[PDB]
């Protein structure tokens, strides 16, 4: 039987080279993921998986709080940090199982959504059953003790190798200095026109008046840039602006704040320029970002109760998520939700990720790389299997008992 197909459908058996046309000298590796997550007091929670992520980021766990909000717990990664040993990567296959081990203890709903985290319209335990219309991309009310298996299915082949966000040789006065070469090919770009002759008007107030000009859903796991410019016009004298950008997490928490304008004084009758020159590095992102908002504070230094403060603005920003549109980098997303699990129980996660990799300079001295086994009918066979996906029942989310049966039905044929 075809190694690649075996690897694709049964990732835990090991890696195999993707039988496409991306002929690069590489090496094959398997990285395990093991976590024992703790259940909060509502007995409900959510694990967000990035099934196709080309690297060490596997997912994020959130617990549902009594007030109905989610709260970030932690990231789910591979056993080792790939960027420390390799510079390029391609995902070959992956599978993870989620089940309670601190065992009749609750149920799981799981779905594979074709967009990115912030694009979900409903993330409730029952709402997720509608995120996709594909019957083989959703699974409902599986007992937590039996568990669910997430299987990564392709979102395109002939994908390029991805830079891993590996550190680069650098020295600096600051011991907290960080330098990396980031995943960049195939950037995702968001364009936000925040104002088109927007008129702001308000009575003076010591300390100024704050407004949130806009708030938009965006997705980011790794480095991103925010560029652009706002132009302000005013008839009033003595106004000064303070502007700040906030990147918010899925749990509503602020993840990043950046000053864009500080005591920026406005001159009457002229175009007042407010540029954006922001770069958010990966190490600063502590949990997935799902929204961005801009705050503007208007103030009049020598003002007094009664003066009117006003200005008009026009402008657009561009948010670039480096490598964001690389299939698997932000989309798709597989959600595994659980409810009614006894508080304090352990939700156990166990999986394998298989990659095609290019070693970093030091490791390259000892790691041989090759083009990889020629297998003439491997791709055709894969295309045949995936086109017959519904007839064969190949799911992205499975009740583990069924996936196990599926594995037998495959090895004994």
Residues 14-43 close enough to bind Ca ion by CB under 5 A: 21
Length of the chain: 413
Cβ neighbours, 10 Å, residue 412: 6
Indicate which of Ca ion, a second copy, Cl ion, none lies near residue 95 (CB less than 5 to 8 Å, by partner kind).
Answer: none
Q: Min. distance of Cβ 185 from Cl ion in angstroms?
A: 5
* DSSP β-bridge partners for residue 46: 62, 337
Q: What is the three-class DSSP state of 135? A: helix
Residues 269-298 close enough to bind a second copy by CB under 8 A: 270-273, 275-284
Closer residue to Ca ion in complex, CB, 211/384: 384
Using alpha carbons only, give the angle 324, 166, 28 rounded to the nearest 5 degrees: 85
* DSSP β-bridge partners for residue 321: 188, 224
Size of the site for Ca ion (CB under 5 A): 2
By CB under 5 A, which span of 68-76, 177-185, 194-202, 221-229 interacts with Cl ion?
177-185
Binding of residue 41 to a second copy (CB under 8 A): no
> CB-side exposure of 410: number of CA atoms within 13 Å?
19
Q: Which two tokens stand for residue 33?
A: 């993921």
Residues 183-202 close enough to bind Cl ion by CB under 5 A: 185-186
Q: What is the three-class DSSP state of 51? A: coil
> CB-side exposure of 407: number of CA atoms within 13 Å?
18
The one among 2, 42, 71, 214 contacting a second copy by CB under 8 A: 214
Binding of residue 192 to a second copy (CB under 8 A): yes
Per the CB < 8 A criterion, the answer to whether 93 and 11 are in contact is yes
Phi, psi dihedral angles at 260 (to 5 degrees): -115, -25
Binding of residue 325 to Cl ion (CB under 5 A): no
By CB under 8 A, which span of 63-71, 151-159, 202-210, 249-257 interacts with a second copy?
151-159
Say which residues have a Cβ less than 8 Å from residue 150's Cβ, sequence separation at least 6: 49, 51, 95, 96, 97, 98, 110, 112, 334, 336, 351, 396, 397
Closer residue to Cl ion in complex, CB, 20/185: 185
Residues 43-82 close enough to bind Ca ion by CB under 5 A: none
In the block, tokens 């967009």 appear at 115
Closer residue to a second copy in complex, CB, 179/308: 179
Per-residue b/e over 232-267, b at no fewer than 16 CB within 10 Å?
bbbebebbbbbbbbbbbbbbeeebbebebbeeeebe
For the window 139-158, what string marks contact with Ca ion as x by the rule CB under 5 A?
-------------------x
Binding of residue 327 to Cl ion (CB under 5 A): no
Q: Min. distance of Cβ 305 from a second copy in angstroms?
A: 24
What distance separates the 2 farthest-apart alpha carbons in the chain? 85
Q: Min. distance of Cβ 104 from Ca ion in angstroms?
A: 48
Cβ-closest position to Ca ion: 21
Alpha-carbon gap, residue 344 to 353, rounded angstroms = 28
Indicate which of Cl ion, a second copy, Ca ion, none lies near residue 130 (CB less than 5 to 8 Å, by partner kind).
Answer: a second copy
Binding of residue 384 to a second copy (CB under 8 A): yes
Indicate which of a second copy, Ca ion, Cl ion, none lies near residue 181 (CB less than 5 to 8 Å, by partner kind).
Answer: a second copy
Binding of residue 238 to a second copy (CB under 8 A): no
Binding interface with Ca ion (CB under 5 A): 21, 158
Binding interface with Cl ion (CB under 5 A): 185-186
């Amino acid at each position: 039987i075809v190694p690649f197909i075996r690897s694709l459908l049964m990732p835990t058996t090991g890696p195999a080279s993707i039988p496409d046309d991306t002929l690069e000298k590489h090496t094959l590796r398997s990285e395990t993921s093991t976590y024992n997550l703790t259940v909060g007091d509502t007995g409900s929670g959510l694990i967000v998986f990035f099934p196709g992520f080309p690297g060490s980021i596997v997912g994020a766990h959130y617990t549902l709080q009594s007030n109905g909000n989610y709260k970030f717990d932690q990231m789910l990664l591979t056993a080792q940090n790939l960027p420390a040993s390799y510079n390029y990567c391609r995902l070959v296959s992956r599978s993870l199982t989620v089940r309670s081990s601190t065992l009749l203890n609750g149920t799981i709903n799981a779905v594979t959504f074709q967009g990115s985290l912030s694009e979900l319209t409903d993330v409730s335990y029952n709402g997720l059953m509608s995120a996709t219309a594909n019957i083989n991309d959703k699974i409902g009310n599986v007992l937590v003790g039996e568990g669910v298996t997430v299987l990564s299915l392709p979102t395109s082949y002939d994908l390029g190798y991805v830079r891993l966000g590996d550190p680069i040789p650098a020295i600096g006065l600051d011991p907290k200095m960080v330098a990396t070469c980031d995943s960049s090919d195939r950037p995702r770009v968001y364009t936000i026109t925040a104002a088109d002759d927007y008129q702001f008007s308000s009575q003076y107030q010591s300390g100024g008046v704050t407004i949130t000009l806009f708030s938009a859903n965006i997705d980011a796991i790794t480095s991103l840039s925010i560029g652009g410019e706002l132009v302000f016009h005013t008839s009033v004298h003595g106004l000064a602006l303070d502007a700040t950008i906030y990147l918010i997490g899925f749990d509503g928490t602020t993840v990043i704040t950046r000053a864009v304008a500080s005591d920026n004084g406005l001159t009457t009758g002229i175009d007042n320029l407010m540029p954006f020159n922001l770069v958010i590095p990966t190490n600063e992102i502590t949990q997935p970002i799902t929204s961005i908002k801009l705050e503007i504070v208007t103030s009049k230094s020598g003002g007094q109760a009664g003066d009117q403060m006003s200005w008009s603005a026009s402008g657009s920003l561009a948010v670039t998520i480096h490598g964001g549109n690389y299939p698997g980098a932000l989309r798709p997303v597989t959600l595994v939700a659980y409810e009614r699990v006894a508080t304090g129980s352990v939700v156990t996660v166990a999986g394998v990720s298989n990659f095609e990799l290019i070693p970093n300079p030091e490791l390259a001295k000892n790691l041989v790389t090759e083009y990889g086994r020629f297998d003439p009918g491997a791709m055709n066979y894969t295309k045949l299997i995936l086109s017959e996906r519904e007839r064969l029942g190949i799911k992205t989310v499975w009740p583990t008992r069924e996936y196990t049966d599926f594995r037998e039905y495959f090895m004994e044929v």
